């Protein structure tokens with residue numbers, strides 16, 4: 227609804243940054259609303275959903291098993307690895323690693339899983355092969371969050387990301403088992419999900435993955451709807467802001483309030 231585009235432009239004014247925004251009907255894929263749909267923004271940890279989509283595609287093809295145990299060492303740990311740093315001794319299964327990557331944004335889990343699929347080049351190839359010709363992963367955690375201005379490494383476009391997430395959650399790319407697991411991991415997000423669930427009306431469904439990078443970069447991808455069922459995908463990215471979190475969070479509050487008011 228254009229009143230939500232007003233809030234998006236309000237956010238650009240107040241944040242001093244570019245905001246990219248899409249609402250997509252989950253059933254048809256129709257763009258309901260867009261702002262900078264085909265500009266590039268760093269994905270940050272929102273890529274971890276696409277990563278686990280590629281992992282589940284391999285599980286579906288018998289190329290991977292969710293219960294396969296992965297071992298690793300102290301020198302593999304990168305910044306912000308709250309789950310993996312506790313299983314050097316135990317190791318973790320593929321399923322636990324996707325859970326940690328998606329619900330806790332665990333960076334080492336993401337890097338372990340990237341290795342399993344062939345690295346950033348193969349994630350990019352997976353995306354291209356499902357019709358996303360622009361989303362690209364180039365680097366590993368934590369460098370892929372660098373967000374250098376004008377750098378196209380590790381970026382998506384809001385519209386491509388929205389279309390890609392709809393395909394993963396509801397298209398024929400993944401089996402029913404896999405598409406349900408992917409959305410279940412997103413529904414269990416511990417980072418942004420509890421805040422969004424609190425803010426939405428009672429009983430709403432939300433499944434999401436957020437990300438944060440350098441240089442003010444932030445983003446969220448989400449499937450949400452009333453009455454316990456998702457019916458829309460919403461993608462928001464921003465980069466370039468020097469605002470703190472107070473001002474940033476007031477801005478998303480305003481966009482989200484409008485999205486719901488005009489649903």
Ligand SMILES: N#C/C(=C/Nc1ccc(Nc2ccccc2)cc1)c1nn[nH]n1
Pocket residue numbers: 228231235260261
């Ligand atoms: N201020 C401002 C900006 C607004 N852009 C924008 C882009 C698309 C729309 N689209 C729109 C569609 C229906 C009703 C009303 C509006 C509305 C606003 C802007 N700044 N830089 N690029 N766009």
Ligand SMILES: N#C/C(=C/Nc1ccc(Nc2ccccc2)cc1)c1nn[nH]n1
Pocket residue numbers: 422425426446448450460462478479480481482483486
């Ligand atoms: N504070 C505050 C408010 C923010 N609430 C709100 C409402 C809906 C959302 N939901 C949301 C979902 C996806 C992307 C972005 C946001 C997020 C926040 C508010 N003011 N009036 N109504 N809600």
